[PDB]
Design an enzyme around this catalytic site. Structure first.
Site, short mmCIF file in Angstrom:
data_model
loop_
_atom_site.label_atom_id
_atom_site.label_comp_id
_atom_site.label_asym_id
_atom_site.label_seq_id
_atom_site.Cartn_x
_atom_site.Cartn_y
_atom_site.Cartn_z
N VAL A 17 109.94 13.86 63.39
CA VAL A 17 109.52 12.89 62.43
C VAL A 17 109.62 13.06 60.58
CG1 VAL A 17 108.51 10.96 64.47
CG2 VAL A 17 107.25 12.48 63.00
N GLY A 23 107.47 24.04 58.37
CA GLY A 23 107.54 23.42 59.78
C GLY A 23 108.33 22.53 59.90
N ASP A 131 102.85 18.82 44.96
CA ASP A 131 104.39 17.95 45.65
C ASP A 131 104.36 17.37 45.95
OD1 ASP A 131 107.02 18.47 46.03
OD2 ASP A 131 106.70 19.14 47.77
C1 LIG Z 1 110.95 2.85 60.94
C2 LIG Z 1 111.07 4.07 61.47
O1 LIG Z 1 111.72 4.42 61.25
N1 LIG Z 1 110.38 4.77 62.37
C3 LIG Z 1 108.61 3.99 62.01
C4 LIG Z 1 108.14 5.47 61.75
C5 LIG Z 1 108.36 7.37 62.37
N2 LIG Z 1 107.26 7.65 61.14
C6 LIG Z 1 106.32 8.17 61.65
C7 LIG Z 1 106.33 9.25 60.77
C8 LIG Z 1 105.36 9.65 60.76
C9 LIG Z 1 103.87 9.15 61.32
N3 LIG Z 1 102.36 10.53 61.12
C10 LIG Z 1 102.01 11.32 60.57
N4 LIG Z 1 101.10 11.92 60.12
C11 LIG Z 1 103.44 11.89 59.57
O2 LIG Z 1 103.19 12.70 58.51
C12 LIG Z 1 104.99 12.99 58.43
C13 LIG Z 1 104.58 13.99 57.22
C14 LIG Z 1 106.79 13.67 56.70
C15 LIG Z 1 106.49 14.97 55.77
C16 LIG Z 1 105.73 15.90 55.47
C17 LIG Z 1 104.82 15.89 55.96
N5 LIG Z 1 103.37 16.75 55.85
N6 LIG Z 1 102.04 17.15 56.75
S1 LIG Z 1 102.23 15.00 57.54
C18 LIG Z 1 103.88 14.94 57.16
C19 LIG Z 1 105.39 12.23 58.62
C20 LIG Z 1 104.64 11.32 59.23
C21 LIG Z 1 107.83 9.26 60.05
N7 LIG Z 1 108.41 8.54 60.68
C22 LIG Z 1 109.81 6.82 61.79
C23 LIG Z 1 110.41 5.89 62.98
#
Ligand SMILES: CC(=O)N1CCC(n2cc(-c3cnc(N)c4oc(-c5cccc6nnsc56)cc34)cn2)CC1
Length: 295
Positions: A17, A23, A131
């Site tokens: 995701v 990472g 960032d």
């Molecule tokens: C609407 C849709 O398309 N969805 C529903 C949401 C989903 N989604 C959940 C996350 C997500 C959820 N929980 C987290 N803790 C997340 O962290 C990140 C994330 C993203 C980028 C850098 C980063 N560094 N630490 S966490 C992180 C994404 C993410 C990203 N996309 C993708 C599909």
């Protein structure tokens, strides 16, 4: 300063995701819980990943992503699952995109500044995010609550000019970023989208004075804040603590931020003169509420 420990064998990993500074983040399950985890893609990332745990062990705040636990079996962090995913996705991601209000826009920024202010106030030494950008800003509680991640670490559109000039920087680089995000949520436009080419073209632009266009009918209190946040000179930027205070005050004029995102939206992107752009959000209700208090 403690970390709950998790056995990796009791986690069921799922689709990717996200990908931060280093990472990879995945959707996953853990004790029947929906969950996000980041892993090392490479053994070489072991060291940076350990420093991030030592920082995240100390942080604790409503607008910072909840780290449930960690593990060293293979090294990994277990976080809460942002159902909404990235702020970047909400603003600019795949259709259908959700409708959102001025109230949402400001509430998001308020919550971000509250999160960073906490970081900046850290003892013995302030944590600088370095960032800040919508891809690192996650949403929960129906689009209502914003949470920061990927901190203490395609970024050029939100980078303070003194950072990429390699020079000395401080807490104030986060304030610049935040100024840019404010613009972004009010306009629902990608900053410096029309510049393009590689990042160095945006760096040259910004270094030489270029900022996002001004916004038709933006209230002046908000405009002065946004543009102070963008000052070339870091000492001219407000502190995050000041931004929090200001933004808390303005929220008087932005009721409705507790409303979950639930309406789809098929807004076109109407290009302005070239000098000024239209906001996506509507400030009519702000000007009316403001009149009742003032003139
Ligand atoms: C609407 C849709 O398309 N969805 C529903 C949401 C989903 N989604 C959940 C996350 C997500 C959820 N929980 C987290 N803790 C997340 O962290 C990140 C994330 C993203 C980028 C850098 C980063 N560094 N630490 S966490 C992180 C994404 C993410 C990203 N996309 C993708 C599909």
């Amino acid at each position: 300063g403690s970390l709950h420990m998790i056995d990796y064998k009791e986690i069921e990993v799922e689709e990717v995701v996200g990908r931060g500074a280093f990472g990879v983040v995945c959707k996953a399950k853990w004790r029947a819980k929906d969950v996000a985890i980041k892993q090392i893609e490479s053994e070489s990332e072991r060291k940076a990943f350990i420093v991030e745990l030592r920082q995240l062990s100390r942080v604790n705040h409503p607008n910072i992503v909840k780290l449930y636990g960690a593990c060293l079996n293979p090294v990994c962090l277990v976080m809460e699952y942002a159902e909404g995913g990235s702020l970047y996705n909400v603003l600019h991601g795949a259709e259908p995109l959700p409708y959102y209000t001025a109230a949402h826009a400001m509430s998001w920024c308020l919550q971000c500044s509250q999160g960073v202010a906490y970081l900046h106030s850290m003892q013995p030494k302030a944590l600088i995010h370095r960032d800040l950008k919508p891809p690192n800003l996650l949403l929960v509680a129906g689009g209502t609550v914003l949470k920061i991640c990927d901190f203490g670490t395609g970024s050029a559109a939100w980078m303070a000019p003194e950072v990429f000039e390699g020079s000395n920087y401080s807490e104030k680089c986060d304030v610049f970023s935040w100024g840019i995000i404010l613009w972004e949520v009010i306009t629902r436009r990608k900053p410096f989208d029309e510049i393009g080419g590689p990042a160095f073209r945006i760096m040259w632009a910004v270094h030489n004075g270029t900022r996002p266009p001004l916004i038709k009918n933006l209230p002046k209190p908000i405009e002065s804040l946004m543009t102070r946040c963008w000052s070339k000179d870091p000492s001219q930027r407000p502190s995050m603590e000041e931004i929090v205070k200001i933004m808390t005050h303005l929220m008087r004029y932005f009721p409705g931020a507790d409303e979950p995102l639930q309406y789809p939206c098929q807004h076109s992107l109407p290009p302005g003169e070239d000098g000024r752009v239209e906001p996506y959000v509507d400030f009519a209700e702000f000007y009316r509420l403001w009149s009742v208090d003032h003139g």
